[PDB]
Structure 1
Amino acid sequence: EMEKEFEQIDKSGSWAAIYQDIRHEASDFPSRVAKLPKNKNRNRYRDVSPFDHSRIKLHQEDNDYINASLIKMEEAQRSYILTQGPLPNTVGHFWEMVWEQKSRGVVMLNRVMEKGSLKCAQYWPQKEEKEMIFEDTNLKLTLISEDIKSYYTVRQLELENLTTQETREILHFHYTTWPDFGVPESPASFLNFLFKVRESGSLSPEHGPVVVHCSAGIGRSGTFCLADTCLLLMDKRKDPSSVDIKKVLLEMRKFRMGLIQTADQLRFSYLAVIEGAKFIM
């Protein structure tokens, strides 16, 4: 059981050591499309690339490339699209992907500015009356409502395909209190946030996969998917303590490189799953 394994690694201070075995054991697959010169300005970080096998393709004939990966968790019956915070020049691609994949939710785990630098383009409208048009992808986005709480904000958005005049409601879940350095002290507000996303239906098989991002789409985004999948496997299995976090992380790393960036994020993931299990048993 992970609670005992937690105390062991903690009392022995072996988090860097565990984290390094995961690094060593992690899959490495080609990411050739990401490295084409014509895609250089579609990537926020040159060392964070989707694998060719799991990459989301835009349905535009010109250039189908976005920095985004489909993570398919077969046993949990859960999919996620992990992506980078959009760039000024990829905001239109981002909303095209949301449209094409029939996503119901967008989960944002960063602030637009952290440590005095921009981590993300402002890719949604700030006021009801000031809608955004993406000319390149022929999409209109409107803020319908905004519910600001202490730890997160939920926004209702309307996405309109200007080509076909179809419209969809998208939910934007924005966790606003992840600290600039390190991880939250307690996983309570993160778990609350996760249960809120679940309650919306955004993670449900009726809909396309949820879009999850932070700045690179590997660190905080990683913790979100790892926690959700581990808690769901604990509901589903005859023996809940058969769930090995490290195994689940390695399975997710076949789909996108670098998920969980630090030993601190790994420790936090254990804590999130351990605490979430109480509210599930």
Structure 2
Amino acid sequence: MEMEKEFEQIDKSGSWAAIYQDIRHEASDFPCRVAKLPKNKNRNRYRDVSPFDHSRIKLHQEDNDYINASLIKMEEAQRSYILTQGPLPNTCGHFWEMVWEQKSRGVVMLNRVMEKGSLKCAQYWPQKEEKEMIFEDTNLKLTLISEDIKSYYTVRQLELENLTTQETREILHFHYTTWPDFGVPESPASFLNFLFKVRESGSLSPEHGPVVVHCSAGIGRSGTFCLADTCLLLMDKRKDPSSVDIKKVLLEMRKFRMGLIQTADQLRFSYLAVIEGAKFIMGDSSV
């Protein structure tokens, strides 16, 4: 597994920070002019995290079509993802409008609402079945149908209703709840198990719109999730599995949204997940 001897060589040489900086130097730099217009200042959670103009998701509405969200389209892998920031108190209606318009089936959330004693995300879904949420600026109603709480993650089933037309869709919410406050998980086993739960749900499949992935800024943990998924897909599809190069897949994803993978230990963790997940897809079905 070329990547696995690349992994051991980089650990041995203690050069993860140098590998990561080289990725930062060669990453694309495209314009983000819409994100920087003054009328959009309260739609952005972080001043240094914006969507490129060429890949941004446009809301289907006159007035203001802006949301901080990017379409990441992986041609060879045949997979698309929408990466977005954690919604703001005033962008929750835009978030669900984007989900409606893009025909997404799943939302993947990789942060908690409060981390390090600060609010990383608005409470954008209902916590109780009997208290639904109405987003009047976008004319959508959201209802909790059920939820399954497990040790490392929670899965919710929600109903999203277009109050204009009274159509309804079922949305699956996949909430990874135990990413540590500092660093990365020591073992990728629980992250891979989470990834495969999302895959089994159908939410990642071409009969649906792209899955919506977010953490707080939509680049760190979010980038790790998409990078691992796409790498494992390429290894399944290809005549030569060990031809998959993580660093070139990461740079290709960074053509669509800036800053994906935010630290050198996130880079290292991404290798770990792909190496370990590759065991579980080269014929070794056992668990």
| Length-normalised TM-score, structure 2 | 0.98
Per-residue CA shift, 1:162-221, capped at 9, x if unaligned? Answer: 000000000000000000000000000000000000000000000000000000000000
Partners of 1:10 and 1:56 lie apart in 2 by 38
Secondary structure of the residue that 2:53 maps to in structure 1?
coil
**How far does residue 233 in structure 1 lie from its aligned partner after superposition?**
0.0
Deviations 1:53-96 (A, max 9, x none): 00000001000000000000000000000000000000000000
Q: How many angstroms does 1:258 deviate by?
A: 0.2
Partners of 1:230 and 1:11 lie apart in 2 by 24
Give CA deviations for 1:86-108 in whole Å, capped at 9, x if unaligned.
Answer: 00000000000000000000000
User: In structure 2, what is the Cα distance between the partners aligned to 1:168 and 1:31?
Assistant: 32
Report the Cα offset of residue 26 of structure 1: 0.1
Identity %: 99
Deviation at 1:141, TM superposition (A): 0.2
Give the Cα separation in 1 of the matches to 2:52 and 2:252: 14
SS at match of 2:128: coil
Q: Deviations over 1:104-162 (max 9, x none)?
A: 00000000000000000000000000000000000000000000000000000000000
Take 2:96 and 2:14, find their aligned partners in 1: how far apart are those partners? 43
Q: What are the Cα deviations for residues 236-275 of structure 1, in whole angstroms up to 9, with x where unaligned?
A: 0000000000000000000000000000000000000000
Match of 1:69, SS state, is: strand
Runs of 4+ with >4 A deviation: none
**Structure 1 CA distance for aligned equivalents of residues 230 and 163 of structure 2:** 36
Residue 168 of structure 1 aligns to a residue in which SS?
A: strand
Q: In structure 2, what is the Cα distance between the partners aligned to 1:11 and 1:129? A: 55
Task: Give the Cα separation in 2 of the matches to 1:228 and 1:93.
Answer: 27
CA RMSD of superposed structures (Å): 0.2
Cα distance between partner residues in 2 of 1:18 and 1:241: 20
Q: For residues 95 and 47 of structure 2, what CA distance do their matches in structure 1 show?
A: 19
SS of 1:270's partner is helix
Total equivalences in the alignment: 281
Aligned position for 1:194: 195
**What SS does the aligned partner of 2:212 have?**
strand
> Residue 274 in 1 paired to residue 268 in 2?
no
Deviations 1:16-55 (A, max 9, x none): 0000010000000000000000000000000000000000
TM-score w.r.t. length of structure 1: 1.00
Unaligned runs of 5+ in 2: 283-287
Equivalence for 2:259: 258
**Whole-Å separation in 2 of the counterparts to 1:26 and 1:182:** 23
| Alpha-carbon distance in structure 1 between the residues aligned to 2:265 and 2:227 | 14
Following the alignment from structure 1 to structure 2, what is the Cα–Cα distance between the partners of residues 71 and 220?
Answer: 15
Q: Which residue of 2 aligns with 1:183?
A: 184
Q: Which residue of 1 aligns with 2:127?
A: 126
- How is 1:1-281 mapped onto 2 (pairs within 5 angstroms)? 1-281=2-282
Gaps of 5+ in 1: none
Equivalent residue of 2:8, what SS? helix
